[PDB]
Amino acid sequence: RPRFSFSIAAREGKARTGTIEMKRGVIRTPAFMPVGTAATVKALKPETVRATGADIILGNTYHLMLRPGAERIAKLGGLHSFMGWDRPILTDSGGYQVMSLKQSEEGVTFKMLSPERSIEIQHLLGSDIVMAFDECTPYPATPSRAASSMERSMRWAKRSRDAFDSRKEQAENAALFGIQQGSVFENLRQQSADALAEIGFDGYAVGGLAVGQGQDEMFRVLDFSVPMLPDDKPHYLMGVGKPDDIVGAVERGIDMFDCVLPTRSGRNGQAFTWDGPINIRNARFSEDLKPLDSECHCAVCQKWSRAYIHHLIRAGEILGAMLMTEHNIAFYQQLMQKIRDSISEGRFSQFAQDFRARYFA
Amino acid sequence: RPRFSFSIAAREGKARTGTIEMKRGVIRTPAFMPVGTAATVKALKPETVRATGADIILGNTYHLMLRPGAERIAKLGGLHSFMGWDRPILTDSGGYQVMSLKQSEEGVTFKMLSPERSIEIQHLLGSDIVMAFDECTPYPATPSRAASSMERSMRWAKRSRDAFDSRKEQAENAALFGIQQGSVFENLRQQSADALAEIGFDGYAVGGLAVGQGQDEMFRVLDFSVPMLPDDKPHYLMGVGKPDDIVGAVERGIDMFDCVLPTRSGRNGQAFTWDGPINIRNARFSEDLKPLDSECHCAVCQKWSRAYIHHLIRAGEILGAMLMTEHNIAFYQQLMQKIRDSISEGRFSQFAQDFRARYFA
Ligand SMILES: N#Cc1c[nH]c2nc(N)[nH]c(=O)c12
Ligand SMILES: N#Cc1c[nH]c2nc(N)[nH]c(=O)c12
Ligand SMILES: [Zn+2]
Ligand SMILES: [Zn+2]
C-alpha cells in the first residue's frame, strides 16, 4: 500500500465516494472516525470498534501528551501497539483541547505546544494522519480577530509542513493535513484555502465550524468554503457531528468526520435510531422488548432489549455504557455505508431526503 | 438433561471432582461462579463470561427485587433472556444482602422478605439453583444467639423446602439447596446439618463463614462441618473467596464457590497472578510490557500489557475495568480447571502445595 493515495470512485453533485489507501490500511470515504481520547475508544475493545465498521480512529495529541506521555508511548512501541489498534490513526494537533480543556507566535504554554512539538508528539505516537497545528477561532469572532487567527494558523501550517518534511521516517510513512480557518467569513476562508493549497497537503480540514455554529450557519459556510479546497484531496470536517449534519456536510463535499457524540452521548443514555435519537433512561422503555433500533445489524441490537439497556444505564452499570456505545458507533458506521452506497449508485440526493423525513418524523 | 444430577468422577482425600447436570447445562466441579448483582457480571458481556470458562453464574435476590423488580423480569421473559445468559444461574435468597446492605419469625421487612417471597422471587427470575432463605449469623456470635439464629434458619429451611415443592414448575425444573449455619460451633453445625439432611435438599451450602473469619478459623470449622453434610450432594461455600481459600476449601470437601473478589477487586486495580496478587496502579508497571500474568491464556493477557492496563485504570477508563475483570475471572476459572484436573489425576495435594509455595513466594 502507498503512504497515501486518495481515489474518487463516484460522484453526485458535490458529494464524493472513494478510498484512502495508507500503509496501515484502506479508509472508505465518506468516513466516520470514532474518537479515542486516552488511548481508548471509551468502553470498547479495539476489535469491537473494528467490528462496527470503523476503518480509522482519531487519537488526541493534547491528552496523551499529558497522560501517559508521548515519549513513554514511543518507548512502549507507539500508540498502535499500546492500545491494540493496528489500523490507521488520525491524531489531532492539540491546540483545540488546549483552548478548551499562554498564547504567542511560538505556540502555547499551558497547565508547551508549538507546531514543532505537536508534529513531534504525533510522530512519537506513530500517527498515520498528522494534523497541522492551528489556532482554533472562537465563535462568534470579529473579522479582525478571525483574520489575525487565521493568518497565524497559516504561518503555523507552513511550520507544521516543514517539521513533518524534516523527519524522514514521518514524511515517508505518514500523511499531513492542513486546516482551514477564517471563522464564517468567505474572504478569510478563501485566503486560508489559497495559503494551504500553496503549501500543499495530503488532505484539507475545515476547522472552526464546531464551536457553537448552528447547522444553518455551518452549512452556509461549507457552501462556499469546500469548493475553495483542492478537489482531488480529502475534505475533513472536524468535530462534526450529528447524523443530519453528516448528511448535509457530505452533500457539500466533505469526506471525513469525527465527533464524540456517539460515544459520549451513548454513555449518557442517548441512542441513535433511523427514527431519530431516543433517551433510553426514559420510563417508556422499562418494559420495551424491542432492540434499540428496528433495523440495526449490530450485535447489541441482535442480543439485548431496550428494557435491559434501560435498566443497566439507570443502574450506572458499565455494561450499559459498553452496549450503548457499541450500538451508537455501529449506527454511525451504517449511516456512512448507506451514504457511500447511495453516492456509488447516483441516488444519494434521494437518500438524504428520505433519511431526513424519517429521522425527523 | 435431568433437572439435577451430581456425579463424582474422582476423589483425593476429602476432595472431589465431577459434574452437575441441569436442564440449562453442565457445571464442572469444583466450580467458581462469577457474581452478577444487577443482572450483569460487571463490565462483562455474557459471552465474555462464558469464554473465561464459567459454567454458571450467581444472581442476587435482594438486588433484582429492588431494581428492576422480580415481577418485571418475569414479564420480560426471566433473568436468562433479560441479561443474555442462557446457562445455569444460582440465585442467593436475599437475607444476606438485606442484613448487610425489621426481623421476625415471619421474615424481614426493610427499606418484605420471608422464605415464601424469596422462593417466589427466585422463581420469577427463572433461577436454576434456588437458595433456601436463611438468617445469616454475624461473626463473632455468642453460642446462644448462634443457636437461636441457626434454629430459625432450620425452620426457615423447612418453609423454603415446602414453598419450592408447592410450585410444580419450579420443583420440576430447578434445584433447591439448604444452608448450614451455627457460626463456628461444632455442636450447632451438627444440629444444622442433621436438620437439613432430614428435610432433604439437592445441595448443601456452608453459610456464615465469610463474615469476618480469618482463613485459619474458617478452615478449622470446615474441617468438622463438611463431613457432617451428605457426601453424595454438592457442598457449597458461600462468599469464599481468595485463590488460597478456594484451594484449602476444596481440600476440605467443598465443590462450589462464589465471591465478588475477582470482579470487584479487578475494577479496583488488583490483578491475580500465580505469583500472587498485584496492584496494577503501582508505578512499577507504568512501562511494564509483560501481560498481567506470565502464563494466563486469557484474551487480555494475549493482547495487552500491564503498562496499558496501568494507564487505563489510572485514568478511570471503562476499558480498564473491562480488561481487569476479564483477566481476573479467567484466572479464577483456570485455577478451578487446574484443581479439577489435579484431583482427576490423584495429584491435587501436590498441586495445592506447589500453588501455595509460588503464590506466596
Ligand atoms: N471547530 C473545531 C474543531 C473541532 N476539532 C478541531 N481541531 C483543530 N485542530 N482545529 C479545530 O478548528 C477543530
Ligand atoms: N458467610 C456468608 C455468606 C456469604 N453469602 C451468604 N449467603 C446466605 N444466603 N447465607 C450466608 O450465610 C452467606
Ligand atoms: Zn444496534
Ligand atoms: Zn490473563
Q: Is B283 on the interface with A (CB under 8 A)?
A: no
Nearest residue of B to residue A68, measured between CA atoms: B311
What value, to the nearest 5°, has the Cα angle with vertex A327 and ends A34 and A250?
50
How far is C-alpha B240 from the chain's CA centre?
Answer: 7
Spatial distance between the Cα atoms of B241 and B182, rounded to a whole number of angstroms: 20
Ligand 4 geometric centre to CA of B356 (Å): 19
Q: What are the beta bridge partners of residue B103?
A: B108
Q: Is B227 on the interface with A (CB under 8 A)?
A: no
Cα–Cα distances in angstroms (integers) from residue B319 to residues A303, A361, B36, B42, in the given order: 21, 36, 18, 12
Query: What amino acid occupies position B124?
Result: L
How are beta strands B129-131 and A203-206 bridged, if at all? unpaired
Atom of ligand 1 nearest to the CA of A207: 12
Q: Is B67 on the interface with A (CB under 8 A)?
A: yes
Put simply, the answer to whether B312 touches A40 (Cβ < 8 Å) is yes
Ligand 4 geometric centre to CA of B358 (Å): 17
* The residue count for chain B: 361
CATH label, B1-361, candidates 1.10.10.10, 2.40.50.100, 3.40.50.620, 3.20.20.105: 3.20.20.105
Give the dihedral of Cα atoms B153, B159, B162, B164; nearest 10 deg: -70
The last residues before gaps in chain A (C-N over 2.5 Å) are 101, 111
Q: Say whether A275 is catalytic.
A: no
Q: What are the beta bridge partners of residue B60?
A: B92
Give the dihedral of Cα atoms A147, A152, A157, A163; nearest 10 deg: 180
Question: Among A38, A67, A311, whose Cβ lies nearest the Cβ of B68?
Answer: A311
* CA-based radius of gyration for chain B: 20
| Residues of A with Cβ-Cβ distance to B84 under 8 angstroms | 303-304, 308
**Ligand 2 pocket, Cβ-based, cut-off 6 angstroms:** B 92-93, 95-96, 131, 134, 136, 179, 207-211, 238-239
Q: Is A308 on the interface with B (CB under 8 A)?
A: yes
Spatial distance between the Cα atoms of B198 and B158, rounded to a whole number of angstroms: 10
Atom of ligand 1 nearest to the CA of A139: 1
Spatial distance between the Cα atoms of A210 and A259, rounded to a whole number of angstroms: 10
Q: Helix H segments across B213-259?
A: 215-225, 243-250
Is the torsion defined by CA of A170, A171, A177, A178 positive or negative?
positive
Query: What is the per-residue DSSP string for B58-121?
Result: EEEHHHHHHTT-HHHHHHTT-HHHHHT--S-EEEE-SHHHHHH--B-SS-B----B-HHHHHHH
Closest ligand, as measured to the CA of A51: 3
Query: What is the per-residue DSSP string for A168-224?
Result: HHHHHH-EEEEEE--TT-HHHHHHHHHHHHHH--SEEEE-SSSSS--HHHHHHHHHH
Q: State the nearest Cα–Cα gap between A263 and chain B, in angstroms.
A: 12
Question: Among A136, A217, A118, which residue's Cα sits nearest to residue A176?
Answer: A118
Ligand 2 geometric centre to CA of B181 (Å): 9
What value, to the nearest 5°, has the Cα angle with vertex A305 and ends A299 and A306?
115
- Max CA pair span of chain B: 60
How far is C-alpha B186 from the chain's CA centre?
Answer: 23
Query: Which method was it determined by?
Result: X-ray
Return residues 31-60 of A near B (CB < 8 Å).
38-40, 42-45
Question: Among A184, A113, A108, A175, which residue's Cα sits nearest to residue A150?
Answer: A184
Q: State the nearest Cα–Cα gap between A266 and chain B, in angstroms.
A: 13
- Interhelix angle A318-344/B318-344, rounded to 10 degrees, is 110
Nearest residue of B to residue A326, measured between CA atoms: B45
Q: Is A84 on the interface with B (CB under 8 A)?
A: yes
| Residues of B with Cβ-Cβ distance to A286 under 8 angstroms | 68, 72
Question: Among A200, A74, A77, A83, which residue's Cα sits nearest to residue A132?
Answer: A200
A3 Cβ partners below 8 Å, 6+ apart?
A22, A23, A172, A173, A174, A175
Put simply, the answer to whether A287 touches B76 (Cβ < 8 Å) is yes
Burial B63-86 (b: 16+ CB within 10 A, else e): bbbeebbbebbbebebbbbbbbbe
Spatial distance between the Cα atoms of B184 and B150, rounded to a whole number of angstroms: 11
A307 Cβ partners below 8 Å, 6+ apart?
A285, A286, A287, A288, A289, B68, B76, B82
Put simply, the answer to whether A311 touches B75 (Cβ < 8 Å) is no
Spatial distance between the Cα atoms of B223 and A108, rounded to a whole number of angstroms: 69
Is the torsion defined by CA of A46, A49, A54, A57 positive or negative?
negative
Residue A206 and residue A236 in contact, taking contact as beta carbons nearer than 8 Å = yes
Which of A202, A255, A258, A293 is the catalytic position? Answer: A258
Spatial distance between the Cα atoms of A15 and B223, rounded to a whole number of angstroms: 76
Query: What is the per-residue DSSP string for A246-264?
Result: HHHHHTTT--EEE-SIIII
Name all contacts of B338-341 with Cβ < 8 Å and 24+ positions apart. Answer: B339/B15, B339/B17, B339/B30, B339/B246, B339/B247, B339/B250, B340/B17, B340/B28, B340/B29, B340/B30
Spatial distance between the Cα atoms of B180 and B153, rounded to a whole number of angstroms: 8
How far is C-alpha B181 from the chain's CA centre?
Answer: 16
Ligand 2 geometric centre to CA of B201 (Å): 17
Question: Among A189, A215, A218, which residue's Cα sits nearest to residue A204?
Answer: A189
Question: Among B175, B84, B77, B167, which residue's Cα sits nearest to residue B127?
Answer: B175
Question: Among B83, B90, B92, which residue's Cα sits nearest to residue B41?
Answer: B83
Residue A253 and residue A16 in contact, taking contact as beta carbons nearer than 8 Å = yes
| C-alpha grid cell, residue A99 | 483552548
Question: Among A68, A165, A80, which residue's Cα sits nearest to residue A115?
Answer: A165
Side-chain-side CA neighbours of B224 within 13 Å: the count stands at 14
Ligand 2 geometric centre to CA of B207 (Å): 5
Reported as type and span, the H/E element at residue A86 is: none
Question: Among A42, A76, A318, whose Cβ lies nearest the Cβ of B42?
Answer: A318
Spatial distance between the Cα atoms of B98 and B85, rounded to a whole number of angstroms: 25
Query: What amino acid occupies position A71?
Result: E
- Max CA pair span of chain A: 60
In testing the pocket of ligand 2, which one of B179, B215, B257, B264 has its CB within 8 Å of the most ligand atoms?
A: B179
B192 Cβ partners below 8 Å, 6+ apart?
B150, B153, B154, B180, B181, B182
Q: Say whether B162 is catalytic.
A: no
In testing the pocket of ligand 2, which one of B92, B149, B260 has its CB within 8 Å of the most ligand atoms?
A: B92
Query: What is the per-residue DSSP string for A314-358?
Result: HTT-HHHHHHHHHHHHHHHHHHHHHHHHHHHTT-HHHHHHHHHHH
Spatial distance between the Cα atoms of B323 and B306, rounded to a whole number of angstroms: 11
What residue ranges do the domains of chain B occupy?
1-361
Spatial distance between the Cα atoms of A336 and A345, rounded to a whole number of angstroms: 14
In testing the pocket of ligand 2, which one of B108, B183, B225, B238 has its CB within 8 Å of the most ligand atoms?
A: B238
Query: What is the per-residue DSSP string for B143-172?
Result: HHHHHHHHHHHHHHHHHHHHHHHH-HHHHH
The torsion angles phi and psi of A350, rounded to 5 degrees, stand at -65, -45
Spatial distance between the Cα atoms of B256 and B131, rounded to a whole number of angstroms: 13
Reported as type and span, the H/E element at residue A275 is: none
